[PDB]
Amino acid sequence: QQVIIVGGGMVGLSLSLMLAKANIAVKLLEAVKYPNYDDVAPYHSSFDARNTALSRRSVQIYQKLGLWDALQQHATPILQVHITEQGSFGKARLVAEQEKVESFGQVIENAWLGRVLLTQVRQQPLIELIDGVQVTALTQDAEQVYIEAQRGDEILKLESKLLIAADGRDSFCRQAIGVGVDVHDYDQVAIVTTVQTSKPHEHVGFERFSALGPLALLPLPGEYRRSVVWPVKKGTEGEWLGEENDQHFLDALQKTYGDRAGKFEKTGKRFSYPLSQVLAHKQAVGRVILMGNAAHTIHPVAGQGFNLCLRDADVLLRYLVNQLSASDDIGNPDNLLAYEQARLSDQQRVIKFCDTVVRGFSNQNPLLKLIRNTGLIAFDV
């Protein structure tokens, strides 16, 4: 092979497929052992399964890869958004209609996204899948990267002209190349789950600004299934978590939305992850490049930062293919530095956008602050 990718997640699996499509062989390393579904294995969307909001560029990226036709089987589009409020300024409704395909994006089930990616990777002869290995050494010289993976008793020694590190927020390769991270924490915790409503969503996403905070209702592939996103202050998560508070969670959703979504009949397990940002100081060190959560972990945004990672993968694929037009060295360090410079503006804009979204959770009645900020009618403050 020519390229080594450390980390076999959504980003790593997607990056290996883009390289294989560009006729670039790749060794993919992953710590966990993948399920070998060999007759066969029936996919069923679980109430406790996680979801991901894909942007239009992410859908287009998978379209060029020829994978969206399969990914669409368990992904639904968002056609409209309905935003409402009822505070000390009046009731207001914001309805936005989509007209271009996937402008509001698609909500895909995570289990289906990884299954399609894993199945297609195993069909590509240019991708050598090496699961059950944990990298424990990484060195560099002027010509190659050297890694030592551990497989129980065996030692695995590999080398390549370029190493792509996509091993998650707690990346091992990032600390091996001596790169620190900056951590920004927020006093918020996102409560996500999957509920079942008597009324179908009809590809409409909902959000209600209440005293409990912004309560989201995203459509799911199931016509009567919805994905809830509910950020709250740290410590307030215990009131809604656990099987003991299943109906209490449904009661808060019912009294907030009333009958706009019908009756909240069932709910799954409520997941909680603190809102924070883990940003690496650098992304390119010699012939090693950080991709995904190894470079930046931005969870509070829609898509959990996955759309930004897919853009990094698409752009890196171009910088490597264009480099191969000039020489046989796909791991040209100056090319990796130029790639990082080309991604700086988009990454900083998303990182700043994440700060705006989290600080916006405190803003109740934002539709009527927009009405006031027009200066058209006379409020009194």
Next chain:
Amino acid sequence: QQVIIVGGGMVGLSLSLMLAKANIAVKLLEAVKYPNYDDQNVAPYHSSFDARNTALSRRSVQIYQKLGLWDALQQHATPILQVHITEQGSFGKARLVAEQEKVESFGQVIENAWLGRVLLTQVRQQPLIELIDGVQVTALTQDAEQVYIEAQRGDEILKLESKLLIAADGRDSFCRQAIGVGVDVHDYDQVAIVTTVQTSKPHEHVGFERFSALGPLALLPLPGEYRRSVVWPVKKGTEGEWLGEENDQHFLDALQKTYGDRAGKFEKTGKRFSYPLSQVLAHKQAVGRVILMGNAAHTIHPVAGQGFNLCLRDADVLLRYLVNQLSASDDIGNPDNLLAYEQARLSDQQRVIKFCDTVVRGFSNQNPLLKLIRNTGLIAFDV
């Protein structure tokens, strides 16, 4: 009498009525001669298409309610019950509809001619208000005890004294220049084109605003069910293609092209007034026994109401300082009491001025509804 208000506009008339309600006699001066309405059938009241309007806040209506005047003022004042903001963009189409919860919260749009008529009529029936019209103040001096002014009627020279002088004589206030107070001017490179239009569809107390390349185009209701006020900020230098009788059809075509059929056909437009968006601030608002009120203290244009709602709040707070001062002294124009009032108003005026900058800077913001849909983290976008 005892208090002299210089300026017989909407502010001076309101202030004189507020002082009269508090049992405070007041002399009111004005440069223009007022038309005694009486029995002259030649001149009743008409809602002219070239007349100005004012958006009154809830507290402003509450102030006129305490004065027993809103029952008559409502005859030519309409409430805003809904606000519809539309927007079209590359990503799609969005609409925001905001309704009213409590009465008067969205405000009332009153005709300026009717407001001045009711105020002037009520002032003339108030014995505690001495109305002196056709007088122009040509001199203003002051000592430790009184203010001295000299007004001219052409041949008659009027000399008046008072313990307190309330200067409400407009943006080019003579009293502000007499006490030696300069102004600070903050200018924007935009002017606002306002006018009154008539539409085939009734507005039904619904105010509209559409964002486009022309800038934010506002359509607000008026007392006439088919009358609407247009608020249109443009860049300085391009207001000529909309002003003038020869551009009446050019102006109506731009309204029809922006709103389509949401307001029916734009049948008729009045004269287009173009006033520059700017803030004129007096360096000081109180010097001795002279105090500035209205546009004499701060001319505020970009916001709805043209600062009038701020002036009524200024007058309401001023009455509280004057009434309490009279409860402990006979000097209603104590300079230190006026200075304590000015500092207490600094917070309100400064936040209105900052709100003006926020409004003006928002004109350059096209597609604001989509930005709100983006800034909530609901769906995945990319810019």
